[PDB]
Amino acid sequence: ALDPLSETKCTLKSFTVEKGIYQTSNFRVQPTESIVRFPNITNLCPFGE
Amino acid sequence: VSMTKTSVDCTMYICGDSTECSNLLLQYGSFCTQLNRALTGIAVEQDK
């Protein structure tokens, strides 16, 4: 990982990149933040019983 | 003449959004890599 050219070199495992189109990796879209929507329960479970 | 060109991702298909599962996939080596080369060849032949 330096420039998209070098990524092709490790992809091909060769220092010579021939003319053409070569698939390097995927495109990952990371989530913005973790969202949590749960029901509201303030009661403790009867573990004593 | 031609068939649907399909490119399968064997990194995401096997392990969804998983780091631990991914490390386990590395133990199996280049198998994932070989699949892309095989399907890539198919897609190229469809244009020929």
Q: Technique behind this structure?
A: cryo-EM
Chain B nearest C-alpha distance from A20 (Å): 12
**What are B's interface residues with A at a Cβ cutoff of 8 A?**
7, 9, 11-12, 36, 40
Separation CA B43–CA A23 (nearest Å): 13
- Which amino acid is it at A45? C
Neighbours of B33 (CB within 10 A): 12
Q: Which of B19, B27, B31, B44 is nearest to B6 (CA)?
A: B44
Give the distance, in angstroms, between the CA of residue A38 and the centroid of all CA atoms in the same chain. 26
Separation CA B40–CA A22 (nearest Å): 10
Q: Which of A8, A10, A29 is nearest to B12 (CA)?
A: A29
Separation CA A12–CA A22 (nearest Å): 9
Q: Please answer yes or no on whether B9 and A23 come within 8 Å at the CB atom.
A: no
Q: Rounded to whole angstroms, what are the CA distances from B7 to A11, A23, B13?
A: 17, 11, 12
CB B34 within 8 A of CB B7: no
Residue B29: DSSP 8-state: T
Separation CA B2–CA B30 (nearest Å): 29
Residue indicated by tokens 């390097």: A24
- Final resolution, Å: 3.2
